Amino acid sequence: QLALGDHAARQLANATKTAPQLSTITPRWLTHLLQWIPVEAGIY
Amino acid sequence: QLALGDHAARQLANATKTAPQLSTITPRWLTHLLQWIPVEAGIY
Amino acid sequence: QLALGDHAARQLANATKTAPQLSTITPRWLTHLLQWIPVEAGIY
Numbered sequence A, B, C: 001q002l003a004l005g006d007h008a009a010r011q012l013a014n015a016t017k018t019a020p021q022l023s024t025i026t027p028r029w030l031t032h033l034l035q036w037i038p039v040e041a042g043i044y
Helices: A006-012 A029-033 B006-012 B029-033 C006-012 C029-033
Strands: none
Touching: none
Protein backbone atom coordinates (compact mmCIF):
# COMPACT_ATOMS: atom_id res chain seq x y z
CA GLN A 1 0.00 0.00 0.00
CA LEU A 2 1.50 3.34 -1.04
CA ALA A 3 -1.06 5.64 0.60
CA LEU A 4 -4.26 5.71 2.63
CA GLY A 5 -7.14 3.77 1.12
CA ASP A 6 -10.65 4.81 0.18
CA HIS A 7 -12.33 2.45 2.66
CA ALA A 8 -10.39 3.91 5.59
CA ALA A 9 -10.69 7.51 4.34
CA ARG A 10 -14.53 7.36 4.13
CA GLN A 11 -14.77 6.99 7.96
CA LEU A 12 -14.11 10.79 8.25
CA ALA A 13 -16.56 11.63 5.49
CA ASN A 14 -20.25 12.66 5.75
CA ALA A 15 -22.60 10.79 3.36
CA THR A 16 -25.36 12.63 1.52
CA LYS A 17 -28.60 11.02 2.72
CA THR A 18 -31.88 11.18 0.81
CA ALA A 19 -35.36 11.13 2.26
CA PRO A 20 -36.90 7.66 1.86
CA GLN A 21 -38.35 6.98 -1.58
CA LEU A 22 -41.88 5.59 -1.93
CA SER A 23 -42.62 3.47 -5.00
CA THR A 24 -46.42 3.70 -4.74
CA ILE A 25 -46.58 7.46 -5.39
CA THR A 26 -48.59 8.29 -8.53
CA PRO A 27 -49.38 11.64 -10.18
CA ARG A 28 -53.07 11.31 -9.16
CA TRP A 29 -54.39 13.30 -12.12
CA LEU A 30 -58.09 12.97 -11.23
CA THR A 31 -57.75 14.88 -7.95
CA HIS A 32 -55.99 17.73 -9.77
CA LEU A 33 -58.58 17.79 -12.57
CA LEU A 34 -61.67 17.77 -10.34
CA GLN A 35 -63.21 20.94 -8.92
CA TRP A 36 -63.50 20.90 -5.13
CA ILE A 37 -66.39 22.55 -3.27
CA PRO A 38 -66.45 23.31 0.48
CA VAL A 39 -69.44 22.11 2.51
CA GLU A 40 -70.44 24.08 5.60
CA ALA A 41 -71.38 21.19 7.91
CA GLY A 42 -70.60 18.00 6.02
CA ILE A 43 -73.97 17.83 4.21
CA TYR A 44 -74.65 18.46 0.51
CA GLN B 1 5.76 35.09 -67.49
CA LEU B 2 4.22 38.58 -67.60
CA ALA B 3 4.05 39.23 -63.85
CA LEU B 4 4.76 37.73 -60.44
CA GLY B 5 3.11 34.38 -59.82
CA ASP B 6 0.77 33.20 -57.09
CA HIS B 7 3.18 30.58 -55.74
CA ALA B 8 5.93 33.16 -55.22
CA ALA B 9 3.53 35.84 -53.93
CA ARG B 10 2.12 33.58 -51.16
CA GLN B 11 5.55 33.52 -49.38
CA LEU B 12 4.75 37.06 -48.03
CA ALA B 13 1.22 36.12 -47.04
CA ASN B 14 -0.12 34.96 -43.64
CA ALA B 15 -2.39 31.86 -43.79
CA THR B 16 -5.54 31.66 -41.69
CA LYS B 17 -5.03 28.67 -39.40
CA THR B 18 -7.85 26.79 -37.69
CA ALA B 19 -7.71 24.97 -34.40
CA PRO B 20 -7.42 21.21 -34.98
CA GLN B 21 -10.72 19.49 -35.76
CA LEU B 22 -11.74 16.35 -33.85
CA SER B 23 -13.98 13.87 -35.65
CA THR B 24 -15.09 11.98 -32.53
CA ILE B 25 -16.97 14.94 -31.00
CA THR B 26 -20.68 14.19 -30.53
CA PRO B 27 -23.52 16.35 -29.16
CA ARG B 28 -23.74 14.14 -26.02
CA TRP B 29 -27.45 14.75 -25.47
CA LEU B 30 -27.78 12.52 -22.39
CA THR B 31 -25.42 14.63 -20.27
CA HIS B 32 -27.38 17.77 -21.16
CA LEU B 33 -30.73 16.10 -20.44
CA LEU B 34 -29.79 14.60 -17.07
CA GLN B 35 -30.10 16.52 -13.80
CA TRP B 36 -26.84 16.72 -11.85
CA ILE B 37 -26.71 16.67 -8.05
CA PRO B 38 -23.67 17.65 -5.93
CA VAL B 39 -22.47 15.23 -3.26
CA GLU B 40 -20.73 16.62 -0.18
CA ALA B 41 -18.05 13.95 0.28
CA GLY B 42 -18.40 11.54 -2.64
CA ILE B 43 -21.05 9.36 -0.96
CA TYR B 44 -24.75 9.12 -1.86
CA GLN C 1 6.86 9.31 -29.22
CA LEU C 2 6.18 10.72 -25.75
CA ALA C 3 4.56 14.01 -26.80
CA LEU C 4 3.57 16.13 -29.78
CA GLY C 5 6.39 16.89 -32.19
CA ASP C 6 7.78 20.16 -33.47
CA HIS C 7 6.88 19.46 -37.10
CA ALA C 8 3.22 18.89 -36.24
CA ALA C 9 3.09 21.77 -33.72
CA ARG C 10 4.36 24.36 -36.26
CA GLN C 11 1.14 23.96 -38.35
CA LEU C 12 -0.67 26.17 -35.75
CA ALA C 13 2.13 28.70 -35.64
CA ASN C 14 2.50 31.99 -37.58
CA ALA C 15 5.94 32.51 -39.21
CA THR C 16 7.65 35.89 -39.12
CA LYS C 17 8.03 36.92 -42.77
CA THR C 18 10.54 39.48 -44.00
CA ALA C 19 10.19 41.76 -46.98
CA PRO C 20 12.23 40.41 -49.92
CA GLN C 21 15.93 41.22 -49.76
CA LEU C 22 17.69 42.73 -52.78
CA SER C 23 21.40 42.00 -53.19
CA THR C 24 22.10 44.79 -55.69
CA ILE C 25 21.34 47.63 -53.24
CA THR C 26 24.38 49.88 -52.68
CA PRO C 27 24.84 52.95 -50.45
CA ARG C 28 25.04 55.21 -53.56
CA TRP C 29 27.30 57.79 -51.91
CA LEU C 30 27.61 60.06 -54.96
CA THR C 31 23.90 60.92 -55.04
CA HIS C 32 24.02 61.86 -51.35
CA LEU C 33 27.17 63.94 -51.79
CA LEU C 34 26.02 65.91 -54.84
CA GLN C 35 24.00 69.12 -54.58
CA TRP C 36 20.71 68.99 -56.49
CA ILE C 37 19.22 72.03 -58.23
CA PRO C 38 15.62 72.30 -59.48
CA VAL C 39 15.03 73.38 -63.09
CA GLU C 40 11.82 75.22 -63.94
CA ALA C 41 11.07 73.64 -67.33
CA GLY C 42 13.71 70.98 -67.89
CA ILE C 43 16.28 73.36 -69.42
CA TYR C 44 19.53 74.59 -67.85
